[PDB]
Amino acid sequence: GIFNTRLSRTFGYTIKRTTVKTPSWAVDMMRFNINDFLPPGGGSNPRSVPFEYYRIRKVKVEFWPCSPITQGDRGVGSSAVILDDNFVTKATALTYDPYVNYSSRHTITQPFSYHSRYFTPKPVLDSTIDYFQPNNKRNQLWLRLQTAGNVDHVGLGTAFENSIYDQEYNIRVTMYVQFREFNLKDPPL
Amino acid sequence: GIFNTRLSRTFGYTIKRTTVKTPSWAVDMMRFNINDFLPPGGGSNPRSVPFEYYRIRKVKVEFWPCSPITQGDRGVGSSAVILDDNFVTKATALTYDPYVNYSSRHTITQPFSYHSRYFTPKPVLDSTIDYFQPNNKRNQLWLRLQTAGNVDHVGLGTAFENSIYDQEYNIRVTMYVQFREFNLKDPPL
Amino acid sequence: GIFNTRLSRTFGYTIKRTTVKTPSWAVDMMRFNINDFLPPGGGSNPRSVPFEYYRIRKVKVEFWPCSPITQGDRGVGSSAVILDDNFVTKATALTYDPYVNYSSRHTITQPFSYHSRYFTPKPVLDSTIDYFQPNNKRNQLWLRLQTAGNVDHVGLGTAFENSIYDQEYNIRVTMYVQFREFNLKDPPL
Amino acid sequence: GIFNTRLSRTFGYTIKRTTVKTPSWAVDMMRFNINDFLPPGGGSNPRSVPFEYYRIRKVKVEFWPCSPITQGDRGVGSSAVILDDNFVTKATALTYDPYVNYSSRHTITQPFSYHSRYFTPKPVLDSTIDYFQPNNKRNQLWLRLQTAGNVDHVGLGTAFENSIYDQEYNIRVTMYVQFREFNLKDPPL
Amino acid sequence: GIFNTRLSRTFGYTIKRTTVKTPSWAVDMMRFNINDFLPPGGGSNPRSVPFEYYRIRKVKVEFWPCSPITQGDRGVGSSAVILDDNFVTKATALTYDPYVNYSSRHTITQPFSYHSRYFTPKPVLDSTIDYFQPNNKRNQLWLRLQTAGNVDHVGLGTAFENSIYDQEYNIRVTMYVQFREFNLKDPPL
Amino acid sequence: GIFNTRLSRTFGYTIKRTTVKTPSWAVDMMRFNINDFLPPGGGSNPRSVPFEYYRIRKVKVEFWPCSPITQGDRGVGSSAVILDDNFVTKATALTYDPYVNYSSRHTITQPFSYHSRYFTPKPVLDSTIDYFQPNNKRNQLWLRLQTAGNVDHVGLGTAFENSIYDQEYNIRVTMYVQFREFNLKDPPL
């Protein structure tokens, strides 16, 4: 019983100002979990979408700027796809862009420019070995939609060039999911 | 955002014994409401299936017998489709089968025989005028999936021939529904 | 060195009687392990079928009744396919059939009727995440035929309607397996 | 339930040295039994390959030398196929090669040369009459895989030319068999 | 960012002499890890090949002899492919060749003969269950190139026939690997 | 063993303000060396990319502005391709644009506009004679990837029109290189 749908979530991210003169970059990570998109249900149905299995097909991360088009001290960054839960260490002012030479690098124009990334994440099945599957719609694993313990999906790391002014963003993540085995429970009343 | 699924519900019905010698029939009615198939949800989602609109496409009423194949004093009844909420009055021992000459009559062999009816019900929009639509999948009205006040659908009346022995049945109603406009709400936690 | 064969096993299951008047259902689970079908071997060959690897292709669960065709208080249940080791909790008299709205539900006529289910199970690789593969004969994983520690396969849950009389069944599970790498060891004597 | 497989076995054979000056030959025989290739099983399965019937299709006898390529006093012998259990009498130093004029003679170069023979043996059904079947894959008799009393198959006799030095060989017999009627027994535990 | 290359490594293996008269075999195992082929890098690049992911496509094990062609007491052994990390126990003088009846057996002529094996190994993801994938270039899992903790690949076991003389070998393993996601890091200086 | 890849590097350039009223231009040069893109390696591998030879195919110089779109006193400049290491002398306020009549001149809109130049540089083999090759992918010379003494490539000179305000830029140079003869060294550990 397949049901392809779309789930979204919005949150903020700010790159604080720095008095540093050099071009330094601010590094951070981004994971994706389905608990943040799918709330708990009620009653005999533990989740709000009554299905048993799921598998995330795609994610769309949108960096919607919060800064005016008149803001100066512009910069240039990079967003890369990291499917293994080993990101570059979080840094405030690093002397280089680590994600620049990555094959999945897209340039981030800053601060007043929109940046989208559309990709297929991978689940963290074993963080010790960090193995994942290649892209195959027919062979992608089905995970279970747990009650409160779903596994973290992974796949984006960023590097933003710091500035004299604060750079704020409203980040909207949209997960395109595919469920299976409609499992609604209908007790009497 | 269409999602065709199937919802079921099971309950009992008994035709008590009678010392009456004549062939008399027991008349009863059967309505269908979605509250009995779809429970209330939890949180910001008032229902367990997160959709706004619905329309019932078909219903399958199954009279599963509870009586052995050795039971005597067998009989013959009738099930008809009544799409307007004006049934023959409920009777214990009526001297005739009212639903026998109906164009939608199917014979009910009793007591140890299975009887199915598969049809398209109609909602009770105005019980004073009792108007309904003909069968058209493209033009069928969409109703709202209310929280605790959904409208009764209608469409089956029965007439069972009484017997010296009690005739029990386990009735399984299956509604084939079609929802629209996925409306999940995901607050933080 | 492929060898497709067929292994069987027979055991009993009883649904005890209840004085409860309502229609209640008895819920139970069913797992499949190869230790119960393949005994230990002897000598340098740890198992009786001299192969290294295996993968279960199909299982046929047959509910052969033990009850006469004259037994009354008949009922109606459901059998569903559960490929993830999270079954509905075992219950003696539950007020509803949980497996009724499942997409893999087959109706169980009770008590004197035969019920078969033919499906492809999945192994329990990680019970925490509960991931499994879709059906693909060419890409199905090969497991190792361990000596005394094989992994449990999963895939059936049932719901039987209780009755005044005891409902007994002789359940015959047949696993259609596929082995690989003939590994017979022939020491002297 | 046919299962064609391959069973092997390795053992030694030595032609001891002789001070005799003349060219003399050492004669010996070679039978084949399935007890030497198939060990006893364990439990309710008396054999390690769980089948009832068998029939030997082919045998490959390989004389793998043990002697260096620098060894002198080389010689020339003969291997013939003897399907009736009446071999030339075993001799240490016979004044001629008895198997030389046989229609199934292959020359054995000695001592450091490989010799293979690939043929279809015959079972010893009656040693008094010594009757056997011609080669026909469709009409070949099925024998029973006994527990500890299988019948000897026959089909090779050799004649090695003696030498001043010892001539050792590691003989690897490979039987290509065909079983029938999978008969595994699975008691409880 | 795919880069198919070839990595090699050379090491020794000796089968010590034995006074035992019988034909006995020496059993041993062979695993493959990428730490032994890929050294650690320097600086911000933890490895010498600047890539993130890898997957081993093929391995070529070459037994290059160290013994002269005049060496006697020759023998015959077997090399088999064992993709599950459960080898025959290491033995000094075992009375039989365990790997002889394996479907992946290749004969090892000893002592002065070259033996190659070219196959696709499998990683040890779970040693408890010992599951692996079949050969599929498109669906083969990508592992992470860890810093100092890579997972052992597996796939060869051997059985060498002992001798009066020591049998030495120089074993050259060549792994044909496929990397992904060039991840060079270029800090200033 | 060819490997085409892409190496990047980012740095700043500022055109300081001037009280001069006339239109004057600021002249500067730009060379390219591979030491600034490829760091030193570690151990027996002197460089981080394990190859012997290289040849630079293309370079992309990107002038990413740092100034707001509201900045006035705009200007117009020129960027030209200079493949011989004899640039116009560096000047702070020159009374004309020297690179304006060059055949390889592209107009630089200032200050808030992006300027890219994509071309094929040439190495400085002899600065006394200053000879270079025409563009030919098949005949381009292979240089050696030295340890700490690589030769400077050349090919861009600029002329920016001065302003009352400071004009800052973040310059991102991307070199598209082609290596040869994979030369990884793997000592033991």
Sequential DSSP letters for B101-147: S-TT-EEEEESS--EEEEE--EE-S-TTT---PPS-TTTPPPEE--S
Contact A55, A153 (CB under 8 A): no
The C-alpha angle with vertex A45 and arms to A43 and A49, in degrees rounded to 5, equals: 130
For A91, the token pair is 């840094």
From A95, A103, A130, residue closest to E187, measured CB to CB: A95
Size (chain B), residues = 189
Note if the bond before E39 is cis, omega within 30 degrees.
Answer: no
d(C-alpha A45, C-alpha A185), whole Å: 6
In this structure, the number of other CB atoms found within 10 A of the CB of residue B21 comes to: 7
d(C-alpha B9, C-alpha C183), whole Å: 54
3-state secondary structure of D136: coil
Contact A179, A54 (CB under 8 A): yes
Q: Does the CA dihedral C2-C6-C11-C12 come out positive or negative?
A: positive
For A119, the token pair is 């990709």
d(C-alpha F31, C-alpha D129), whole Å: 101
Say whether F43 and E45 touch across the interface (CB within 8 A).
no
What distances in angstroms separate CA C76 from CA A120, B66, B113, C166, D142, one per listed residue? 44, 9, 14, 15, 51
**Best mutation target, D38, D45, D175, D186, to test chain C (most C CBs within 10 A):** D186
Fill in the DSSP letter of residue A85: S
For A65, the token pair is 């700027």
Residue type, D15: I
Note if the bond before C111 is cis, omega within 30 degrees.
Answer: yes
Q: Does the CA dihedral D35-D36-D42-D47 come out positive or negative?
A: negative
In this structure, the number of other CB atoms found within 10 A of the CB of residue B65 comes to: 21
Residue type, F110: Q
What distances in angstroms separate CA C3 from CA C108, C180, D2, F154, one per listed residue? 34, 7, 10, 68
Fill in the DSSP letter of residue C129: T
Determine if residue D181 is left, alpha or beta; phi over 0 gives left, psi from -120 to 50 gives alpha, anything else beta: left
Nearest to D158 by CA among D112, D110, D122: D110
3-state secondary structure of A151: coil
Radius of gyration of chain F (CA): 19
Q: Which residues neighbour F21 within 8 Å (Cβ) at sequence distance 6 or greater?
A: none
Largest CA distance in chain A: 68
The C-alpha angle with vertex F112 and arms to F107 and F118, in degrees rounded to 5, equals: 45
Nearest to A113 by CA among A157, A79, A74, A155: A74
d(C-alpha E31, C-alpha E59), whole Å: 11
d(C-alpha A182, C-alpha A149), whole Å: 20
Q: Which residues neighbour C70 within 8 Å (Cβ) at sequence distance 6 or greater?
A: B68, B69, B70
Q: How many beta-carbon pairs under 8 angstroms link E with F? A: 62
Which residues does chain C have within 8 Å of residue A183's beta carbon, measured at their own beta carbons? 101-102
Residue type, A167: Q
Strand partners, F31: F154
Strand partners, F157: F29, F80
Strand partners, F134: none
Contact C186, E96 (CB under 8 A): yes
d(C-alpha F26, C-alpha A91), whole Å: 37
Q: Which residue's structure tokens are 């030595």? A: D14
Looking at F90-151, which runs of residues are DSSP E strands? 91-94, 106-110, 115-119, 122-123, 143-144
d(C-alpha B20, C-alpha C46), whole Å: 74
From E23, E72, E97, residue closest to D12, measured CB to CB: E23
d(C-alpha B166, C-alpha B163), whole Å: 7
Nearest to E150 by CA among E123, E112, E121, E113: E123
Shortest CA gap C102–chain A (Å): 6
d(C-alpha B33, C-alpha B143), whole Å: 12
Nearest to B153 by CA among B175, B169, B178, B128: B175
What distances in angstroms separate CA C115 from CA B173, C57, C111, C158, C169, one per listed residue? 22, 20, 10, 11, 10
Ordered DSSP codes for D47-110: ESS-EEEEEEEEEEEEEEE-S-TT--S-EEEEEE--TTS-PPPPEEEESS-GGGS-TT-EEEEE
Q: Which residues neighbour F54 within 8 Å (Cβ) at sequence distance 6 or greater?
A: F34, F142, F143, F144, F145, F177, F178, F179, F180
Nearest to A83 by CA among A156, A185, A186: A156
d(C-alpha F98, C-alpha F87), whole Å: 10
d(C-alpha D24, C-alpha D17), whole Å: 11
Nearest to B184 by CA among E138, D102, A3: A3
Shortest CA gap E57–chain F (Å): 19
Q: Which residues neighbour E58 within 8 Å (Cβ) at sequence distance 6 or greater?
A: E118, E119, E120, E175, E176
The C-alpha angle with vertex C149 and arms to C3 and C136, in degrees rounded to 5, equals: 45
Pairing mode, if any, of strands A75-80 and A106-110? antiparallel
Contact F73, F112 (CB under 8 A): no
Say whether F186 and E9 touch across the interface (CB within 8 A).
yes
3-state secondary structure of F6: strand
Nearest to A153 by CA among A52, A15, A61: A61
3-state secondary structure of F71: coil
- End-to-end CA, chain B: 27
d(C-alpha F52, C-alpha E167), whole Å: 39
For F176, the token pair is 């598209």
What distances in angstroms separate CA B5 from CA A32, A38, A171, A183, B116, one per listed residue? 29, 21, 35, 11, 20
3-state secondary structure of C115: strand
Say whether C133 and A141 touch across the interface (CB within 8 A).
yes
Neighbours of E, requiring at least 3 CB pairs below 8 Å, are: A, C, D, F
Q: What is the resolution of the experimental data for this entry, in Å?
A: 3.5
Q: Which residue's structure tokens are 């259902």? A: C25
Nearest to E60 by CA among E3, E124, E119: E119
Contact E143, E37 (CB under 8 A): no
What distances in angstroms separate CA B25 from CA A153, B74, B92, B98, F96, one per listed residue? 64, 12, 7, 9, 112
Residue type, A134: P
Contact A116, A109 (CB under 8 A): no
Nearest to D20 by CA among D73, D87, D98: D73
What distances in angstroms separate CA F30 from CA A97, F113, F126, F157, one per listed residue? 22, 19, 18, 6
The C-alpha angle with vertex C36 and arms to C30 and C37, in degrees rounded to 5, equals: 110
Say whether C134 and A142 touch across the interface (CB within 8 A).
yes
**Best mutation target, C2, C33, C48, C173, to test chain D (most D CBs within 10 A):** C48
Fill in the DSSP letter of residue A134: P
3-state secondary structure of C160: strand
d(C-alpha C174, C-alpha D163), whole Å: 63
d(C-alpha B53, C-alpha B41), whole Å: 15
Nearest to D82 by CA among D38, D117, D53: D117
Which residues does chain B have within 8 Å of residue A3's beta carbon, measured at their own beta carbons? 3
Q: Which residues neighbour D21 within 8 Å (Cβ) at sequence distance 6 or greater?
A: none
Question: C15 φ, ψ to 5°?
Answer: -105, 105
d(C-alpha C82, C-alpha C124), whole Å: 12
Q: Does the CA dihedral F97-F98-F102-F108 come out positive or negative?
A: negative
What is the dihedral angle through the alpha carbons of D108, D114, D118, D121, rounded to the nearest 10 degrees? Answer: 70
Shortest CA gap E179–chain F (Å): 13
d(C-alpha D84, C-alpha D131), whole Å: 7
Q: Which residue's structure tokens are 């009375």? A: E95
Nearest to C159 by CA among C78, C64, C76: C78
Q: Which residue's structure tokens are 């050696």? A: F144
Nearest to D170 by CA among E19, E75, E160: E75
In this structure, the number of other CB atoms found within 10 A of the CB of residue C158 comes to: 27
Q: Which residues neighbour E67 within 8 Å (Cβ) at sequence distance 6 or greater?
A: E111, E112, E165, E167, E168
d(C-alpha C49, C-alpha D50), whole Å: 7
3-state secondary structure of F35: helix
Identify the closest residue of chain A to B188 by CA–CA distance: A36
Question: A108 φ, ψ to 5°?
Answer: -105, 110
d(C-alpha F64, C-alpha F67), whole Å: 9
Nearest to F59 by CA among F148, F153, F169: F153
Burial class of residue C22 (count of CB atoms within 10 Å of its CB; 0-12, 13-18, 19+):
exposed
Which residues does chain A have within 8 Å of residue B10's beta carbon, measured at their own beta carbons? none
d(C-alpha E80, C-alpha E155), whole Å: 8
d(C-alpha B62, C-alpha B13), whole Å: 12
Contact B32, B153 (CB under 8 A): yes
3-state secondary structure of A143: strand
For F183, the token pair is 């030369």
Question: A98 φ, ψ to 5°?
Answer: -70, -30
Note if the bond before F121 is cis, omega within 30 degrees.
Answer: no
3-state secondary structure of C150: coil
For E19, the token pair is 């006074």
Which of A84-88's residues contact partners 24+ apart within 8 Å by CB, and which partners? A84/A122, A84/A130, A84/A132, A84/A154, A84/E52, A84/E53, A84/E144, A85/A31, A85/A124, A85/A127, A85/A130, A85/A152, A85/A154, A86/A130, A86/E144, A87/A27, A87/A29, A87/A157, A88/A27, A88/A157, A88/A159
d(C-alpha C45, C-alpha E98), whole Å: 11
Q: Which residues neighbour F120 within 8 Å (Cβ) at sequence distance 6 or greater?
A: F56, F57, F58, F59, F135, F155
For F44, the token pair is 């027996």
Nearest to A82 by CA among A7, A132, A137, A151: A132
Helix H segments across F9-83? none
For A126, the token pair is 């074993």
Shortest CA gap C110–chain B (Å): 10
For E76, the token pair is 């015959």
For C143, the token pair is 């497991």
